[PDB]
Ligand binder design. Sequence first.
Ligand SMILES: CCCCCCCCCCCCCCCCCC(=O)OC[C@H](CO[C@@H]1O[C@H](CO[C@H]2O[C@H](CO)[C@H](O)[C@H](O)[C@H]2O)[C@H](O)[C@H](O)[C@H]1O)OC(=O)CCCCCCCCCCCCCCCCC
Ligand SMILES: CCCCCCCCCCCCCCCCCC(=O)OC[C@H](CO[C@@H]1O[C@H](CO[C@H]2O[C@H](CO)[C@H](O)[C@H](O)[C@H]2O)[C@H](O)[C@H](O)[C@H]1O)OC(=O)CCCCCCCCCCCCCCCCC
Ligand SMILES: CCCCCCCCCCCCCCCC(=O)OC[C@H](CO[C@@H]1O[C@H](CS(=O)(=O)O)[C@@H](O)[C@H](O)[C@H]1O)OC(=O)CCCCCCCCCCCCCCC
Ligand SMILES: CCCCCCCCCCCCCCCCCC(=O)O[C@@H](COC(=O)CCCCCCCCCCCCCCC)COP(=O)(O)OC[C@H](O)CO
Lengths: 78, 114, 475, 100, 168, 48, 361
Amino acid sequence: PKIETRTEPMVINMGPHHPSMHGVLRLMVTLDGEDVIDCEPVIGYLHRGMEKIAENRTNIMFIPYVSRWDYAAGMFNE
Amino acid sequence: VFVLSGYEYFLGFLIICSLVPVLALAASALLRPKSGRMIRLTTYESGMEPIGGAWIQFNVRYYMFALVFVIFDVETVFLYPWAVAFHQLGLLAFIEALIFIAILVVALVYAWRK
Amino acid sequence: GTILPETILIVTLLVVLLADLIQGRQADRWTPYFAIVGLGGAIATMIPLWTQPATISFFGSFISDHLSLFFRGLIALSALGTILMSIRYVEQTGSSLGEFMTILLTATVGGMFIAGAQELVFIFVALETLSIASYLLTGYTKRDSRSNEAALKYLLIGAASSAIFLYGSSLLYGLSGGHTQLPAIAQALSSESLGLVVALVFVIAGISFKISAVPFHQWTPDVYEGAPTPVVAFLSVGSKAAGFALAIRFLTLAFPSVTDQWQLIFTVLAILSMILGNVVALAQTSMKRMLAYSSIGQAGFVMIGFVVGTEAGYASMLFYLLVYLFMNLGAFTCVILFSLRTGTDQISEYAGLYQKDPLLTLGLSLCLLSLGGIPPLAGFFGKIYLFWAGWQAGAYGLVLLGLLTSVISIYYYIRVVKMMVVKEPQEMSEAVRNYPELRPLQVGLVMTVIATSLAGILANPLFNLVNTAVWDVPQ
Amino acid sequence: MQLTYVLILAALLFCIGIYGLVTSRNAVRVLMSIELLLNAVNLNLIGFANYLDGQQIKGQVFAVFVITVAAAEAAVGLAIILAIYRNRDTVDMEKFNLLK
Amino acid sequence: MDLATLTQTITFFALAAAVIIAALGVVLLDNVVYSAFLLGGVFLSIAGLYILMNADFVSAAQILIYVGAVNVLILFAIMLVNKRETYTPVPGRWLRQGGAAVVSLGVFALLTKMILQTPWQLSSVPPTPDSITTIGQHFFSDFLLPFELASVLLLMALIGAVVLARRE
Amino acid sequence: KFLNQITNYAKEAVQSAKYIGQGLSVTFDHMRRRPITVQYPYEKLIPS
Amino acid sequence: IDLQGQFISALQSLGLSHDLAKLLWLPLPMLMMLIVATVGVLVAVWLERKISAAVQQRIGPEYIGPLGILAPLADGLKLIFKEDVLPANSDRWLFTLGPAVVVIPVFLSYIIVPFGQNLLISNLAMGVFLWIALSSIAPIGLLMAGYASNNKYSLLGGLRAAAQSISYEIPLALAVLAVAMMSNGLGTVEIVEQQSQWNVWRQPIGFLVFWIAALAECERLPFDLPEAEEELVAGYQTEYAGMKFALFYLGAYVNLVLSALLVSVLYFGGWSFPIPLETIANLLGVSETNPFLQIAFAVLGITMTLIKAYFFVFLAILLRWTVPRVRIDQLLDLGWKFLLPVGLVNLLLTAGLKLAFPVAF
Ligand SMILES: CCCCCCCCCCCCCCCCCC(=O)OC[C@H](CO[C@@H]1O[C@H](CO[C@H]2O[C@H](CO)[C@H](O)[C@H](O)[C@H]2O)[C@H](O)[C@H](O)[C@H]1O)OC(=O)CCCCCCCCCCCCCCCCC
Ligand SMILES: CCCCCCCCCCCCCCCCCC(=O)OC[C@H](CO[C@@H]1O[C@H](CO[C@H]2O[C@H](CO)[C@H](O)[C@H](O)[C@H]2O)[C@H](O)[C@H](O)[C@H]1O)OC(=O)CCCCCCCCCCCCCCCCC
Ligand SMILES: CCCCCCCCCCCCCCCC(=O)OC[C@H](CO[C@@H]1O[C@H](CS(=O)(=O)O)[C@@H](O)[C@H](O)[C@H]1O)OC(=O)CCCCCCCCCCCCCCC
Ligand SMILES: CCCCCCCCCCCCCCCCCC(=O)O[C@@H](COC(=O)CCCCCCCCCCCCCCC)COP(=O)(O)OC[C@H](O)CO
């Protein structure tokens, strides 16, 4: 029922469920006593395949699609 | 013999207050869905699976902050009857309590300097 | 009320703070001095109140008679001798020196307070002040596993001994109505009962832990190997001083001398100490462990001073307890000086030291022979007075055992002088074959060695002192 | 509720603390047993103060001091245990024997 | 023969049973954290026993220090030293276990005989209710040396413990 | 050397107190304005 | 009036063993204080949700009751009916006990909340000191909620919670110390009856220290570290589902009404409509046995206590949305580096002013 502390660098998973507005990013980060040794960001939880779609849609068919890459401002990418 | 006046209420109220959680948590147990056993029973790791190993990388970060707390927790116990009885004492007790507090201040400075 | 008897302790107390704040600001400091100066001032503060005033009490909670001054000066001198040895020792280790001298001076303050304390609460507080600082000093070199295991062992034994002593103190407070005072308990209970015997044995269990009386001895051989060697030097002189002071002030003055079953108990413990601590010391390979068992044996010797208490056994005990300071400070200074240079090792590595370093040999052999009881030397007269104070009372068996154990001790004390002198250039140990070729260490070594060789024949000036101190023990 | 009952209870707590201090193998449990022992002592002191010396209570101040110093000795003992653990990497009290 | 004394007896025996069971759990249980919490249970029961003995200040002080400071320290340290407990059984165990058991039972019987035999001086005068002002008077009149030396005790304990548990 | 550190500490503490008092006043002022909430089920927002 | 006198007398009129009547009365105040504590919890939840909405140009709950009055009732009844979960390898008995050890001593500290004289459960001799001692059991509850979890996420939250609740216990005691210096004692009624014509005007530093320490009891968004959602998900609470989580949700607002009432009684006083009311001899009222004047002054005292408790509840749930959070290390520097020195300084200052000017102290 416990976690068995041991003198190593600890790896914590700030996984895909970010209770914030910073999308879905995994960020497996290790730390040695309130530091950061190195983090491995695990992106890709929102790869829907826009590049392969764009090859099969005409321009006016694709222009509604573009407002998604970088949501916000959905007019730069337009 | 017992001459502590006010006690009668601390025992009865201790009972009636300890009865609040063990009654609400039993009323909730009577009327609530049954089991949810299979995979409801895992540990929340932001949706992913626990990485394995699962240690903490022990730190003295929270032993020293409890050592220094024990020290001054004892200090307050030593200082309470001095403050409550500061009327009958007068001077020459302020001097001794002041020596006590100065020693504890040097202790705090030592803990704060490292 | 009458805080004058405290201007000896508060001085040292001030040093504890001043040799601490300077370590907060500087961290590379010369606190070894103004700590020697602090103890020197604390000792010089005793001359005004050694003979000038009569015996005084703080509030009944502390007494400053001549016996108290004797033991306070004894513990202060032990701390002064330990500060000298521990300068280049804990500095050679990657550790601080101010945070060590504060602990050492606090242990000294506790030992000095427990000497003149005559109340249950204050006795407990002084004893625990000594014990906590003893644990902290034992586990100081936190890099070595032996030091940590020794500190853990010593703490687990000493805390249990203190719990037993506290149970005895609570029983003693409950038997005699209230009266946390010591002299007000003798007036209350003046008859042997089961409660009084149980309180007596439970106090003895916590006294013998301090003075190393067997079967309450089994920690010194494991603590002397573990602790830093200057901590061991302070622990074999100052801790026994405090323990014997507390035993005299407690047993004689609190436990109504009508219940002198403690004389039987201490006869048992002294016989057992003499027999064990000298027989087992005979088969040892390290110098610190040998000195541990030797220290047990010497405590057994001292315990025939106040087991026949006759105003001459007390004086014999005090004189041997004073000479033991010069013997053991000088026997530990040479051990430190050898383990510093190259050795860092045991008895077998002493072989051939007469060629490379003759001063260390001439200083260590003198102290080992003094411990053995060799004529003119501080130890011979100490032991002769211990043995005659034992015959003059009627304890034939105790003295006839002390003599045989003195021979057993001469054997393994001269076995070290064997290695130090005998060897030719082909029989030097590997630690002497490459022996190299720190001023306070030498100036403490020379002083303790010239004291252990002259305080034997120039003993008359420090027999009147012992007698005026003994005049205060009740009987 | 008599003095003899409180004293027998304190003696029995002393007994249990001794058993735990000698038998237990983990290293923090011996410290907890020492705390049990000191509580068995404080109970004696408070019982004596309540029954024998009830006006100028002197066992209660002595008990305050005992509690203070039990806290201090615990603060030092856990430090000693952390130091020995940092090097031996265990708390098995049957592995701190550097002797024969 | 009263309703007050009946409550003071029932509560005393309830707290005594709690003390015995929790103190046996501290030393017998195989898991160490259960012992760490039953220790706070012991301390709370003894704090109640103090209140039942007209000592209201020292009970609150015990709750502050033992089940509020020493217990939290013990819980932290028990967490710091978790390594899944691979204790291999040692042969010379039944010897020391049996010795501890017999010496404990013998010492307890001896103490019980001593307690039931000696004639304590009960001094039937009701105690004082204002038990904290008296403790305040004794810190600076009678117990001035211990009150003053406890400060240096705490300082040396802090110094030494920071030195031992430091990280370098 | 040591007085400049203390005067900087004071100039930081009093600044942190004023910059909390200002925010407290701003928030206590905010609760006088009419809520901009468009209480949907009974105050539906007419589209463009 | 002395309702206790009438109750015990009318109960002894029909026999029933007069000494037993005094035992048959304890449940009456022992549950009146429970009632007022539960109503205070409902009020605190409602005030938080409706004041955070006003601060942000918003509207709180309005479709539950008339004004969202039934919002705390719904939020509690939901958590009652929720399925409780106990994860795979978590302990089974320290799990369901953490949320109860963090709650029982928060309720028990209501013995000393006066609400006017003779209107409190058994004014105790230890009073505020008993509360200082009882407020040290919750860290055991947080360590228990963290140790009994297979989630290393939540053990790290239990540790940083138990390490914050002990950081703000020394200054919280050094402020009550300076108050008890002036108060001549520790009982709350005896602490407040020194206001006979307020301690905030003579302890202007101890008030600040006490209030900051009480707000830093893992309570408010100034700190609320184990509840700081963004940095870590709920800390130790991240695994409690039904009533076990409602015990945390509840033991954190009762621990706020309690602190508001305590600041009121220590530094302001649950009595004393500001003028020295009991010097209303100008209406020639024989207070002593006036059958009413008694009830009128009772109502005045209750209202004057609740005004100054609501003042601080309001100010706390206003600072929640005004002060930015501190990481954990800027937090542990408030205690032990700013609040502990200033607490000691305030204690020494009160001592010096009490020794020099024994009048007004
Ligand atoms: C969720 C939160 C809210 C929920 C409500 C709580 C649930 C209870 C609902 C029932 C409400 C009906 C009760 C009517 C209130 C009048 C009763 C009263 O005042 O009774 C008062 C008496 C007084 O007691 C006596 O009071 C005497 C004198 O008053 C003293 O009171 C203080 C002590 O000194 C003052 O300092 C004062 O100067 C002093 O003289 C003596 O002290 C006696 O020793 C003492 O026994 O106590 C008593 O029985 C009172 C005991 C019952 C407590 C209930 C009080 C509820 C608060 C209602 C306040 C109404 C405000 C105005 C209402 C109209 C709107 C404008
Ligand atoms: C056979 C089966 C039996 C099973 C038993 C179970 C069944 C239960 C029975 C019925 C349930 C009734 C429950 C409540 C009834 C009310 C009882 C009461 O009135 O009890 C009266 C009690 C008792 O105290 C009173 O106390 C005084 C008497 O002195 C004595 O009273 C106390 C007890 O001794 C103290 O010790 C005091 O020092 C002592 O001297 C008074 O004059 C009365 O006599 C006395 O009764 O009142 C107090 O305790 C003060 C606490 C109340 C104060 C109210 C302040 C109210 C708060 C405001 C409300 C709004 C809050 C909402 C906002 C909140 C936001 C923070
Ligand atoms: C004047 C009052 C008189 C009575 C008052 C009682 C109030 C509380 C109890 C309500 C009556 C039913 C209780 C039975 C317990 C239980 O849950 O059984 C299990 C069944 C579940 O159904 C069952 O579900 C079961 C599976 S499961 O476990 O629920 O998933 C399944 O086995 C079963 O066949 C299926 O039917 O559930 C019920 O019977 C009721 C549970 C929920 C009822 C909530 C009522 C809310 C009342 C609170 C608000 C009132 C305000 C204050 C009033 C004082
Ligand atoms: C922090 C966690 C807890 C730590 C400590 C827990 C330990 C509990 C504390 C122990 C409390 C001590 C013992 C209580 C003493 C009971 C007897 C007593 O107190 O005497 C009083 C009277 O005692 C009683 O009458 C109380 C007995 C009843 C208490 C029983 C508990 C009540 C249970 C709930 C009520 C149920 C009622 C319905 C039952 C049918 C004295 O009266 P007084 O204060 O007025 O002083 C003067 C006196 O009136 C005359 O001179």
